[PDB]
Amino acid sequence: NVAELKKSFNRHLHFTLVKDRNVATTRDYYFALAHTVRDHLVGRWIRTQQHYYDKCPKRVYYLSLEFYMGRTLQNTMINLGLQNACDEAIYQLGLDIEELEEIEEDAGLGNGGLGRLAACFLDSMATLGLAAYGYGIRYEYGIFNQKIRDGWQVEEADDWLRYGNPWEKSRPEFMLPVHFYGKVEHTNTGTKWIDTQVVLALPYDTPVPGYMNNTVNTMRLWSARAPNDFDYIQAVLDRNLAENISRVLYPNDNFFEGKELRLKQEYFVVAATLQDIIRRFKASKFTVFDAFPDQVAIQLNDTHPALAIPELMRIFVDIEKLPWSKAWELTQKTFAYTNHTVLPEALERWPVDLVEKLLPRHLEIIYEINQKHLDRIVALFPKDVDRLRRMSLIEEEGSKRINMAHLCIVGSHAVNGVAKIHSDIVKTKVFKDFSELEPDKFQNKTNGITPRRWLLLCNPGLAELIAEKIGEDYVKDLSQLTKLHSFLGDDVFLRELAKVKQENKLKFSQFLETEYKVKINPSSMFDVQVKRIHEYKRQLLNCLHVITMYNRIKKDPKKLFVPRTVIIGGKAAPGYHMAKMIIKLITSVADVVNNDPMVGSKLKVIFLENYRVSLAEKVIPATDLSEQISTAGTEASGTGNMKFMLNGALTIGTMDGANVEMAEEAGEENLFIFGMRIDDVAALDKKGYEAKEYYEALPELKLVIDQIDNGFFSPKQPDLFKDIINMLFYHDRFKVFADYEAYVKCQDKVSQLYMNPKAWNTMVLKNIAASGKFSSDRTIKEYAQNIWNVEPSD
Amino acid sequence: NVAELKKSFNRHLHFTLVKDRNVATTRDYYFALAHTVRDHLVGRWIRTQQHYYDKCPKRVYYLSLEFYMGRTLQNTMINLGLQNACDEAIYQLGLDIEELEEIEEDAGLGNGGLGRLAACFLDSMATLGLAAYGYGIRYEYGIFNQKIRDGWQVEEADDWLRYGNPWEKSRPEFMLPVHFYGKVEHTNTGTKWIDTQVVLALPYDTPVPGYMNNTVNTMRLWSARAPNDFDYIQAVLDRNLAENISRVLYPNDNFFEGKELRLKQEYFVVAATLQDIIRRFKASKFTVFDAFPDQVAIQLNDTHPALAIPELMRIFVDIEKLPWSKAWELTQKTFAYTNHTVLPEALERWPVDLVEKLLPRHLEIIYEINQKHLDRIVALFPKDVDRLRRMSLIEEEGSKRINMAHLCIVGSHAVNGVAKIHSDIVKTKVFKDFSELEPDKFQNKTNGITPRRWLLLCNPGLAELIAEKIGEDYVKDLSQLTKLHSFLGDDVFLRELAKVKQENKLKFSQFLETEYKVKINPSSMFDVQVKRIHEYKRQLLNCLHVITMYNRIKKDPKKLFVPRTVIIGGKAAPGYHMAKMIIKLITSVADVVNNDPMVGSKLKVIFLENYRVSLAEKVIPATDLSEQISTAGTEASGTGNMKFMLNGALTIGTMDGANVEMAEEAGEENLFIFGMRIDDVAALDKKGYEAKEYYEALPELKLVIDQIDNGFFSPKQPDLFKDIINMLFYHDRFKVFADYEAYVKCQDKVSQLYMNPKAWNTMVLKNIAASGKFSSDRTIKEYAQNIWNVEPSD
Ligand SMILES: O=C(NC(=O)c1cc(F)c(F)cc1Cl)Nc1ccc(C(=O)O)cc1OC(F)(F)F
Ligand SMILES: O=C(NC(=O)c1cc(F)c(F)cc1Cl)Nc1ccc(C(=O)O)cc1OC(F)(F)F
Ligand SMILES: *C(=O)c1c(COP(=O)(O)O)cnc(C)c1O
Ligand SMILES: *C(=O)c1c(COP(=O)(O)O)cnc(C)c1O
Ligand SMILES: CC(=O)N[C@@H]1O[C@H](CO)[C@@H](O)[C@H](O)[C@H]1O
Ligand SMILES: CC(=O)N[C@@H]1O[C@H](CO)[C@@H](O)[C@H](O)[C@H]1O
């Protein structure tokens, strides 16, 4: 109750912050409230973990180099049923809760969809009350902070832990050695890894509260420490190198960069996690190891934690002294692999020299794994020499590299894609060789998003509305949102829905106006593309359509033009050149567009800085139009798309990733789908893509290109954007021009629907009403049932 | 009372440590109590700090690169008067109170005498209710942990913070920029210090509980961070370099090491501190700095923060735009300097080259000071061409250096030494050129220790006994120990006092044998020498006496030997070769002596690994004879000496430092004074030191030296102590041999007296009852009256 939360608050401000109202900072207040809310989950946290130890359910271990968590405070209140009481307590003390909430750093330990998938899943597994753990790296620096200076992305260290983090508790008793380098002896007592350099792994536990149940699971992130025995001053300074491992998240989205530190990160998180799991299994009730796969599941979050396979084997054979065949039966039965990667350059392949010098034993074990593997292939295909090098874990040509996917495929009992279409290509095409051998191993699990964070928290208006119509069951069972179909003809419900959208718009319009000094037309269409910047996602194409909108105003200023506020956001990897260019182009266009007095309030372009979990929560609920426009074949699933759908936006995009499943659910009539489908893409590769042909064929495209290339957007470097021009014309893998017309045409349909409130909101409601599939609660049921084989409990 | 303490402890264990009783670790329990205890000073801390904000009395800032704090928990309990009740609470919960206490890390952020002086000072300024603050660096790594391995010193990093520190509260709101490098620009707005690299300074507060009053003063310690703004991974890894500024404490006792990083440390703390003071001053109720010196004193703990002088000037002139002359009058009035050393090699003397690179503005301000300095020497000494070079701040040979001592002298209103003999020599000899001009500038302020850590804490037995006899008011006014004179008659007493000391040697003997392979004779005379390993402190001269003794059982195994445990402990600077060998020797000697079955239990020799504050709290109360044997004129004061006086041991030592003053106080017949006085060393230098004379001249010495050199103590390597011997005959500036004879004869009388229980304890009593002068409480009044001009309120 209120009075008690108020007494807790003051107690913390007093004792934990050593402050009285008189000189208390806003941060002092945030902290005091966090501690008050965190205190309210301790009992359930102990009891949950206690129950796991007493009843030994099969535990699920989600293993990942990335947990894109965002802020905890508000998410935690909501899931404890505490938000309203806290709101009121804080209000009564003359403070503003939204103000305190603003203080919190994001836990930006993620790049995008892969890392955010991890986050939604933990929330989901806690809500369904599974025995689940999150395991990854406690990066000192998460994804970097993005400033824009002269329309250019600028990186600033995400110093997220400067002031401390009250959502983590260290665990001094569970520190582990992790080993690197050294050499292998195959003595007559077992094979032994010796003369290694040691890093210590200190774990931190973070509470994963379930939505209104009694479960609080754990996320355990590891930290790098130097040992005490593995110039005096320099020696002590040198301890920096060991602790460097957990220092900074690699900021690459969908790109492999074969850096040594990264390899160290990957073993580091694998090694400590695997010990902790064995330790726990051994400390429990339960070749006592025969029960291990009845008590352990390890989901590989892409190939990043791939070493987990040769590591488990290493532990089983060398320490546990199990015979290799047994060790391998159990490895296969413990692991499952989730494939998210699509393009050649994202594929992790590690050079053999590197894997040999850093981890000799793992190399040996990997070769051994490979031998057993290629043996079986020879046996079923003796005249087939090419199938051998094709399915080998070693890409034997030149450099020589380990194909971590191949390793995950052979060490796991289940392999999965993240959307129907994708798993499909994965199974029938990309892995034809392996799936032929065991069709049943390969499955789909279409992606999902938590409707806690992504409806309840980021959008309480909608949540309340929906709840006032159909009650609150939908939160824990999003399929219940179909009940809304029975409100389609409800003229008054449509108004309340539009009102909700408009408040989100008004609020967010404040944000834009107070952060960018740019006049927002409150009633224009909020047309939003937020994701990481990559040529495949095609921010560029959107950008082109912006230019077309602008020109259309210029040629004919009196002509009926539906006002849009066009928002583009997301971070470019610091080494991704073309991505940085694509940013500079957008900010350039905005400068022209936002100041051309002849357009004024008809068109406003914002490039949205420092896009991240807590910003997604702001902008998404405020959106009318969700840009989702990758080249078909290039987007494994996507999740933003889903979050827009649930929050009352209409989606414009290609038949790619889960967009396809969105269209099935709500019916294509109710999305703005356009463009080449995968076939249309292949057929164009077959015949051959000539970018030129479209530039001559479409006069509006011709102008846009000409404007960009001749400095209309860059009079001080008329040829600033040349690199974009070349790529567009000669090296564009993603066929930007081939989809232009279809896109623009499709854009004009959105425009016309927008001029009919009733039709538009009717489509909105048919979307929201069908968004239920996309709850990460459904996804997890599916993983639980056909992969982990654990049951929900409560 | 106790019931609230049990609740609180449990609330912490539950809510702060997230543990129930059956899985709580020991660390868990420690923290739970620690937090409980901190809570109980919070009120007195806020009020003490409020109250200075209110009445606004003059503030004392003790600025030191070093704070040798030791452990906090028990000191805090005692001073807060809650040891009783806390003991109970822990007991009633079935927990070992002292096992808890042993979890706590020494805050080992000093080398020895200097950093412990500061730590005692804090306790006393708080006990006397001064508005005082300590400013230093939050070193990530304190003085190194010493391990003896094969009789050698090995160093381990002192990772005191890895499990966190319950006694500090970060103050993020008071974070600051410090500036480095760049270059000076002489524009017509004045001098701009430009293109500087910025390091962040983040303060952390530790409570300083006065003894049984209302005062809780603050110790602010600063940590280095990289700023905000900048190969991206590499750029991020490189933040390590800015943070290296506060990473490790330099481990030289009485020795100057001119490393760039150390200069950075020195600037860092001076810069953060001076800003923070200015901030506090402007924030109070006082562009008007006239009252600054009335509001603020800053004591320069030796020359380490000398840089504060030209920083304050720079702030005043460059930033506050005050006239040089005024800005200068204010500085001298603010600062005061405590000289702590006389060894030429311990004087800080910075290459201008380095200072010009790192602090180009500061170099100028120093020149500019020297100029103005040197000018007014010409006005009074127009023909003394030599006087100038003798008094300039700049030593001009080859690559010029900055004489930081001289700097501190010109820039402070008071310069003081740390004992009568020291200060006297500082005034009349070392800085005669200066003192002649302002005789009143130079003073003495004799060192002391706190009777809290060093009596009630470490030796509860002795304090209990004293309190029984004379009331418990001696704890706040030590001089009341004179009262214990009434008891010179009393044998009941004398036997009671002997009891206590025996009880300590027992406790201590149990710990001692459970460490080293050695059979301890618990009623032998405990001959303890502990302090940093130094040629000057002459642990060697002690080692020579130890051999001597052993050679007197080998010669005559059936003559009466007064039996003694000889304990020598201390850390050698990693870079200090002689001291490392000297340790090696003592351990060799140790291994020969403890394994001659003939010597048996007559003489055990123990080298005490890892001497530090909490270790000192154990061995001192268990001591009979205190070795204070530095060459006359080398120990500026000593503070070990005083601790052993307070704790019921008798002193064997030279007429050096405060020894002179302990003798003074107790009567010189009540200490074992011996060997060369100050003039004797003076004489011998002019006559010339000729070591071989005592080797020829003295048969008993001669054996000792031959054993060493021919390898009696290193058989498997008869060559080992080559350099010890060489040093001793052609290089020993500290004249071990010249006092060899006086010393041994002196020891012989100690031995003679130890066979007289009654006379011995009568001398021990005469020592304890006259130790009142040496309370740091007395030292502080004196600075308060005569340097800081502040008033002992509460
Ligand atoms: O009290 C606890 N605390 C925690 O486990 C805990 C500690 C943390 F530092 C943290 F950050 C998070 C958590 Cl959740 N656990 C517990 C209680 C009782 C028992 C029993 O078996 O009686 C066994 C127990 O350990 C386990 F984990 F098995 F439940
Ligand atoms: O609330 C406080 N807290 C502290 O001072 C403090 C904060 C810490 F984080 C810490 F680690 C230690 C302390 Cl001791 N102080 C205060 C109260 C009331 C007033 C008024 O003027 O009404 C002014 C005040 O500030 C000042 F500094 F003056 F004491
Ligand atoms: C949401 O999943 C999310 C992503 C992924 O969005 P896309 O599915 O790539 O469009 C990236 N960044 C943030 C902050 C998220 O919330
Ligand atoms: C005690 O003062 C102390 C010192 C300094 O003692 P000396 O005066 O040099 O003999 C050094 N180290 C520790 C741990 C002390 O408590
Ligand atoms: C390598 C990588 O981040 N892949 C991404 O994985 C997420 C989570 O499944 C998908 O939503 C997205 O379409 C896909 O691009
Ligand atoms: C520089 C340094 O460490 N000096 C030491 O200072 C302490 C405390 O002032 C004195 O006890 C000691 O005699 C002196 O040698």
mmCIF file of C-alpha atoms in Angstrom, chain B residues 25 35 50 76 106 119 181 205 212 214 267 316 425 447 472-473 489 494 523 525 529 608 615 696 748:
data_model
loop_
_atom_site.group_PDB
_atom_site.id
_atom_site.type_symbol
_atom_site.label_atom_id
_atom_site.label_comp_id
_atom_site.label_asym_id
_atom_site.label_seq_id
_atom_site.Cartn_x
_atom_site.Cartn_y
_atom_site.Cartn_z
ATOM 1 C CA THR B 25 28.050 -17.276 3.452
ATOM 2 C CA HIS B 35 25.425 -2.256 6.613
ATOM 3 C CA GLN B 50 24.457 19.865 8.119
ATOM 4 C CA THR B 76 33.138 2.113 14.090
ATOM 5 C CA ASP B 106 42.438 -3.624 5.282
ATOM 6 C CA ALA B 119 44.429 7.743 9.495
ATOM 7 C CA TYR B 181 48.971 18.084 -21.212
ATOM 8 C CA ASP B 205 32.644 9.428 0.961
ATOM 9 C CA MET B 212 31.581 8.705 21.824
ATOM 10 C CA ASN B 214 28.043 13.365 17.929
ATOM 11 C CA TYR B 267 47.892 16.550 -9.936
ATOM 12 C CA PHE B 316 42.732 32.308 -8.690
ATOM 13 C CA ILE B 425 67.000 19.903 12.438
ATOM 14 C CA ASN B 447 53.439 12.915 16.182
ATOM 15 C CA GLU B 472 37.434 5.304 31.567
ATOM 16 C CA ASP B 473 38.066 8.978 30.852
ATOM 17 C CA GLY B 489 53.429 0.279 44.914
ATOM 18 C CA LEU B 494 51.820 -5.326 38.735
ATOM 19 C CA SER B 523 56.841 -17.149 27.873
ATOM 20 C CA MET B 525 60.716 -12.529 25.658
ATOM 21 C CA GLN B 529 60.589 -5.125 15.246
ATOM 22 C CA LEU B 608 56.206 -11.866 9.922
ATOM 23 C CA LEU B 615 48.348 -7.296 11.774
ATOM 24 C CA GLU B 696 88.853 -6.373 13.106
ATOM 25 C CA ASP B 748 72.362 -7.862 27.323
#
